[PDB]
Amino acid sequence: TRGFQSMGMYSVMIQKVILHDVLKFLFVYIVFLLGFGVALASLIEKCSSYGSFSDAVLELFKLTIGLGDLNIQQNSKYPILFLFLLITYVILTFVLLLNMLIALMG
Amino acid sequence: TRGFQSMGMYSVMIQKVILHDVLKFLFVYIVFLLGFGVALASLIEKCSSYGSFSDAVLELFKLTIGLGDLNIQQNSKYPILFLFLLITYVILTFVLLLNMLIALMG
């Protein structure tokens, strides 16, 4: 798509945005993902969805992009602390980090 | 709505945005949709939701606009590869392509 004129501006944008902004935002967002992943997975009693580390990291990735369930009842011993950590993660990355990335990409 | 003054600016915007930007973004986004549609539908064993090509293309369109389920268990023989392709599609079009289109429409 470099043969046309109005498509070269669309083929260079992908490279500029992946190399400038999305690598930066992912290099920050991974530390929030890891921190809240181990801070959520380690207080689930072993017998809900947050059983392992690598299921809690997938659940937090689903919760960042608007999927996933923010239900209350996971098999925890501290449900208010679990819910406070989940609300803090959603306010940090669904609202604060993601839209700041979109302001940068703009 | 060309009889008013504050509605002519709203009736010409639809035509300028459909002809300039959304045709361009769809003419790029179709190649990602087709590529990941055949790269997902061809490793599903025939017996989950990704049975045919024209159901996997609908599932990827639902996943682009924030609908659809990014569940793990589809009837695959390579679940980690399937999940890596699905995460790569969501990072390419839910985050990178769609918001770049909204920056262009702005």
CA A48, B89, B99: angle at the middle one, nearest 5? 100
Q: Which 3-state string (H, E, C) describes chain A?
A: CCCCCCCHHHHHHHHHHHHHHHHHHHHHHHHHHHHHHHHHHCCECCCCCCCCHHHHHHHHHHHHCCCCCCCCCCCECCHHHHHHHHHHHHHHHHHHHHHHHHHHHC
CB contact under 8 A, B28 and A1: yes
Of B72, B87, B96, the CB nearest to A18: B96
* HSE-CB of B69 using CA atoms within 13 angstroms: 8
Cα separation, B48 vs B46, whole angstroms? 8
Resolution rounded to one decimal, in angstroms: 3.7
Amino acid occupying residue A22: V
Q: Is A66 annotated as a binding residue?
A: yes
Alpha carbon A92 to chain centroid distance? 9
Tell me the chain A residues in contact with residue B106 when contact means C-beta distances shorter than 8 Å. Answer: 106
- Number of A–B residue contacts, CB under 8 Å: 37
Cα separation, B52 vs A88, whole angstroms? 40
CB contact under 8 A, A58 and B66: no
Tell me the chain A residues in contact with residue B31 when contact means C-beta distances shorter than 8 Å. Answer: none
Closest to B61 measured CA to CA, from B94, B88, B96, B13 = B94
Q: Are A67 and A61 in contact (CB under 8 A)?
A: no
- In the three-class reduction of DSSP (H, G, I as helix; E, B as strand; rest coil), residue B18 is classed as helix
Q: How was this structure determined?
A: cryo-EM
